[PDB]
Subunit: 334 residues, 4 copies
């Protein structure tokens, strides 16, 4: 099996560990964080939104044991000091949020890892990958790769269909997004100086920035610069919705045409539904994006149209499933 | 001679109780009677204590036939059929119709039959009546009306924004999403829904819930010159009050900037339409009395060549923002029939 | 198979349906509620806290079809008008909340049903059953039975151990309880005139009454009148905790003695844990009561002691699992 | 006026600032935190649970201006490096959560402050004060003082009445408590290694420890060791309840006797209600404890009784009001 180390055993890190248990060919041999083994094991076992871990978890000397298999744990904030060479790490899943740059993530390579896959958008000379939209741009020689964002994984397959089938002129996005760990529990100073993420997460509708639409060109180059938009963080603990409003080249477009085009492009990454679901219904789902045909709207005044669509995503498990698909493909290629 | 306008509140719910509270601070208007489907102890308690809007500042005491507020008697009734209420005997000038069950001109006429002079419905309503957003189209009321709609919370948030966009830039078309606080028409836990809505059927405080709204689709009732040019829906989310309306538009004027849009909105600001450049969140608008609060920090202009999309957002307290507007319209409607 | 009808396809009714799919010899052939079939099918498929239904549901002519088998649906507010005789109904699961009385529940017997099991405490000359505490009191001749309450199922096995091993003098209970459908979404008049259940359910700590401790004698006769207490409804959608503070006959009681006695009494209904869990960790669990050893306290001043214990329960699934156990047992005996 | 510096402009720090605007002869001249002035001014202006600050707040050179008064701001994590001598600080209101110990808080004294009042329980040789229960124990010479906890402030006036009027044998407590900033937004490693405070704050009933009952003897010495108990953190953003179950020496006790005793002891710190309120009703209240007569229970089996009572508190504003009362009193002494 391909030997995986997880750096940052947080929401994405732990869910990635869970997902990897189901993927033949990938094995987590080590985890790194900033805490004790009792804490690591406990948070793997128990998960507020994603439910209890299926297998058995036991704290042992040097880490924890999951279903018989030992996992080595470390508590090293400086990635360059990790014993990746000694453990023969093939790929690091970088999930801390503190190495979201090619040069920063290179620390893992210096430490002895063969490759790094970052669980977030990242700057620098690297490829940004949404599985089943642009993963074929990987050839296996890459040392550092980005798995994009939760929102980009929800948006990319939708934007691709709109452009391919109708011709995208321009568009604006709003994602109604579950609150995340970069937000405060109570009103308090925020480390990034963000006066909105400073506010009590579970008691507010909170406007905030996102790169998903603005930076869509890193995943779909042919629509580079044609999208922008933002986010509204709301009091659900996981589960999100991306709404997109577009101008198209094709004219006299119908709701039926848009839905059929989306249904035709469905796969394991891009789901299609006509059920009147709500955010809790997508918790734990493994589609990167779930197109909701019930929300499609077309505004027509004369020969001028606006087309609006919406797609659900579990910002946790939807993204994690996509990240692990990319991880496996990156591993297979090399 | 001159007297305070005698108001009766039908439906002592969220809007009804907040209207009562608001009227306490508006001179020339007095609530003499309330009607609901419960006991006086319950009515007094819910007036006194309010989860989101805070403790009532007056003194509330249950008495014979109703309750006393700061020494002033309010008559209470528990009659589901509006035509049976003693509006004649009580000399009722205007009924604030806040039950959600008389949202129709013919149905709301029951209050007029009962002896009230006028009815203002706290919601969109069917029939041949006028739909009024204060400080957008209230001057369309001539005084001959007997049944009027106070529009919706969302329409009150949307209308001043849509008017500025059209007046200054020319509205071609647009789409709206309101990120809206959950309301009493939603279930506490997943359960069958009275109106058959499979989404309002779901646990209100645990979900992002898509739902329809008339605000954009029916904007033409308030701003006739943009009839049919808007559409959109709602996303109900787990805040108990406080909402946001986002509007994405195509405009006639070219090379529009964020600065131009913000300045145009600021110039249109009044007691109904507020303006902010502060990075606020939903809890910051709870209890506010603007019908709509334009958030300049959320303005975006997408340009690709000569083609532009403009996006704006305005906050509203679906409860107090709408209530303040409703009371403004109430006062004006009574003023016309001196 | 035992032919089951569910009156009231609500939280307990639907979860009972789900659990029955896992029990050979138990079959739901009919459901009665006050809504359409599309609604019933949708709420079976999608569940905010309990997750997506495993199998597949299809709306048909008579009602709905689940995994091949058809389920008939009705809309009679008066249960005596239901065609239970024609459908040869063996047991009605009474889950509406409107027939919580022996004489009221008799409506189903008049309609043609052989037995009624009410999913709540009930007034009248009937047996109140907590599975694995007093289910042996059933002989199979009963026509109307109560499955008790969620809180009683959490409390009974704990109270029994305390009395058996230490001698119960007296106690007081508080359950920190998930909000339920008998509470309002927003501050509004309450149908029962309850000024506290009138308040916004998900925004408040709300004191309220319970019959679990006061009526414990219906399940454990030897401690009748020895307990009382109440509830505090809080903003979690499901998952609850029962705390019990008692005076005991035995002296010099220790935390270890209490925990060991509870562990020794553990079974499929009564769980034991030493893990530092929280409420979300018990969502979907099938124990009727999960004793939490980390919460045990003994206060000693001279020869006088107060003993405090706590047990978790999913007021939904914990109760439902117990109700179906009692159903299967009652159906087996005659 | 007594010159106050606030260390840690957080929930308690900011509410204390607001409360000090209500107290004559007490001025906040300086604030220290770990952020910039834009953020400090914003969080003073806008408050999710406690509402908008009514006055004018503007960012100026070297801090911010509130209602015509300049507040100097700093961003220094090491308290011994603060300019307290230069600013002539009379009392530091220590609200960071990182100086809850006599010897650690001495850093403020070394920096030039005359006194320190800690906004939490604290270790070391100091007094622990619940205003209107034991503030008379202060004489004005103390250099470092603890303002106790939110829970202790809710508990002490109740426990005192129960002992004075009925004779306290023993008791156990549970506080059903709003979630606070020491809890995580999502399930995540917890800085203090608490596996329960690690969990998503607003989605769980979370058992946790509290010292309020176990350490009541610091406030009421005559009942030292007679109480214990813990907390259940629940998804309300502020507003809490303390439930206390006791054995008393007085026999044949009634609900009426207990309720009357509590009402007789009511003052500006200890309120009394017979209304069927809920947690949101106490948000922003200034009583340290609100006794709820509707929740009083007496369980009798033979001559053996268990007595249960409950008191509400806004863990934020109730505690803050008490802290500022103690602050004013401490300042008034030795003037
Ligand atoms: N919905 C989501 O939560 C979501 C979705 C997609 C992507 N992401 C991205 O994934 C990353 C992690 O997000 P998360 O929500 O899991 O955050 P998290 O806080 O839950 O996880 C981060 C973990 O990394 C650990 N950590 C921090 N610094 C470290 C260091 N220097 N060395 C080792 N461990 C360290 C922390 O202890 C924590 O456990 C972020 O970049 C985020 O943008 C999050
Ligand atoms: N955000 C908002 O809550 C909001 C905003 C704008 C408009 N509205 C509209 O205002 C109306 C009331 O909404 P609400 O949120 O206050 O609902 P609510 O449920 O809180 O209030 C309705 C009240 O009317 C009472 N009632 C029902 N039928 C009655 C009858 N036949 N006779 C007398 N009383 C009766 C109920 O007991 C209840 O107290 C609705 O039409 C709604 O669409 C609501
Ligand atoms: N935690 C819990 O939800 C829980 C736990 C244990 C016991 N219970 C008990 O179970 C019962 C149901 O609880 P619930 O939470 O599922 O309530 P619910 O409101 O979710 O379900 C009740 C269902 O019964 C239907 N109904 C009402 N009147 C009817 C009638 N006359 N005829 C046919 N159907 C009717 C309603 O449409 C609704 O779908 C109650 O007695 C409750 O006390 C609930
Ligand atoms: N319910 C309550 O929130 C409550 C009630 C009673 C007592 N307390 C106590 O009050 C204290 C603060 O609680 P809070 O809820 O306001 O916490 P908080 O997180 O909201 O505020 C703490 C503030 O101190 C700042 N800070 C941290 N380290 C610092 C340093 N070294 N130098 C300067 N500033 C620093 C932080 O940036 C933050 O703004 C804690 O000891 C807590 O136990 C809290």
């Amino acid at each position: 099996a391909v030997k995986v180390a997880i750096n940052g055993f947080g929401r994405i890190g732990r869910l990635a560990f869970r997902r990897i248990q189901e993927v033949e060919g990938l094995e987590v041999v080590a985890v790194n964080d900033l805490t004790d083994d009792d804490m690591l094991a406990h948070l793997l076992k128990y998960d507020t939104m994603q439910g209890r871990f299926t297998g058995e978890v036991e704290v042992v000397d040097g880490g924890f044991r999951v279903n018989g298999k030992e996992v080595k744990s470390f508590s090293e904030p400086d990635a360059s000091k990790l014993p990746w060479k000694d453990l023969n790490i093939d790929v690091v899943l970088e999930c801390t949020g503190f190495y979201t740059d090619k040069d920063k993530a290179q620390a893992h390579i210096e430490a002895g890892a063969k490759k790094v896959l970052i669980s977030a958008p990242a700057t620098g000379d690297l490829k940004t990958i949404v599985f089943n939209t642009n993963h074929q741009e990987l050839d296996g020689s890459e040392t550092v790769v980005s798995g994009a964002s939760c929102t980009t994984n929800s948006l990319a397959p939708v934007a691709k269909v709109l452009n391919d089938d109708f011709g995208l002129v321009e568009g604006l996005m709003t994602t109604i997004h579950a609150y995340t760990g970069d937000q405060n529990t109570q009103d308090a100073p925020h480390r990034k100086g963000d006066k909105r993420r400073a506010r009590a997460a579970a008691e507010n509708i909170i406007p905030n920035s996102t790169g998903a639409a603005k930076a869509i060109g890193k995943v779909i180059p042919e629509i580079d610069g044609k999208l922008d938009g933002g986010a509204q963080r709301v009091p659900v603990a996981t589960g999100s919705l991306t709404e997109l409003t577009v101008v198209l080249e094709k004219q006299d477009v119908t709701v039926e045409q848009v839905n059929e085009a989306m249904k035709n492009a469905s796969n394991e990454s891009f789901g299609y539904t006509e059920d009147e679901i709500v955010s809790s219904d997508v918790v734990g789902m493994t589609y990167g994006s779930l197109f909701d045909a019930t929300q499609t709207r077309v505004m027509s005044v004369g020969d001028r149209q606006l087309v609006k669509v919406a797609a659900w995503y579990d910002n946790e498990m939807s993204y994690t499933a996509q990240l692990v698909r990319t991880l496996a493909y990156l591993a297979e290629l090399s």
